[PDB]
Design a protein around this nucleic acid. Sequence first.
RNA 1: AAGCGCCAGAACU
RNA 2: GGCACCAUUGCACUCCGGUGCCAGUUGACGAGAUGGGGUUUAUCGAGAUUUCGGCGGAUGACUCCCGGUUGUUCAUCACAACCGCAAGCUUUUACUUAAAUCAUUAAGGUGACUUAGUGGACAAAGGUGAAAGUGUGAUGA
Length: 90
Amino acid sequence: RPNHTIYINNLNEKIKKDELKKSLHAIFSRFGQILDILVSRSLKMRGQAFVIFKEVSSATNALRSMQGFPFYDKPMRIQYAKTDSDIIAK
RNA sequence: AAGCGCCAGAACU
RNA sequence: GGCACCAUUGCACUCCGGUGCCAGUUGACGAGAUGGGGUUUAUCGAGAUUUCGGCGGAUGACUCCCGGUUGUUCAUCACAACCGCAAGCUUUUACUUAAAUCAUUAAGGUGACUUAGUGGACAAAGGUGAAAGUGUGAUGA
Ligand SMILES: N[C@@H]1[C@@H](O)[C@H](O)[C@@H](COP(=O)(O)O)O[C@@H]1O
Ligand SMILES: [Mg+2]
Ligand SMILES: [Mg+2]
């Protein structure tokens, strides 16, 4: 079902880790306070992000509102995290 | 203040 | 680390697909050492290392000079070795001669790395005094 962490994909792979990590924070900061955004660039983890909210309330609203939103010329695909994240789980 | 200087090899980011 | 091109729609949380091409970073730790000219592969140890490879320089070495020291107390030549404030050869002997490494803890940088402090060290080539044996002939005052 729902989760503190939201899984975003279909992100522009041409954008560098830190720029993407900050450009994400710009738009998701209104829904609630973000604990950490996790972005890698490997073959397995590129075009994806892990915006973690302290509140699931924020995660639900962010999912509803930002679904399909144009981000670097590419529409976002937002799900919930399949499993909890460590800064929540621990 | 001369085992001292710079850097298309090469290792490393 | 970054651009590009191929490949990838991918649920991760100690970094990490392939191909090129550009940027960056590392690249000698101190001791030692300059009369002039030419020549050549330029002294010494420390360090587990790239202190590798290339280029340049260089106070080294050889060798011909310029001066000087010393050669049976003085000079001027021969001849021999020597010195460029320091000066004939050999030997035994005594004293003198660092900084990195390290280990630390601070700054900076995505980054490999950088610059700086603290801790105690640990050399060799040299250098110094001491002895011991010793080093031409010709001519002149
Ligand atoms: N003092 C050193 C010398 O001992 C060394 O011969 C020379 C050449 O160095 P390299 O052999 O790295 O070219 O450099 C310096 O001058
Ligand atoms: Mg490869
Ligand atoms: Mg070299």
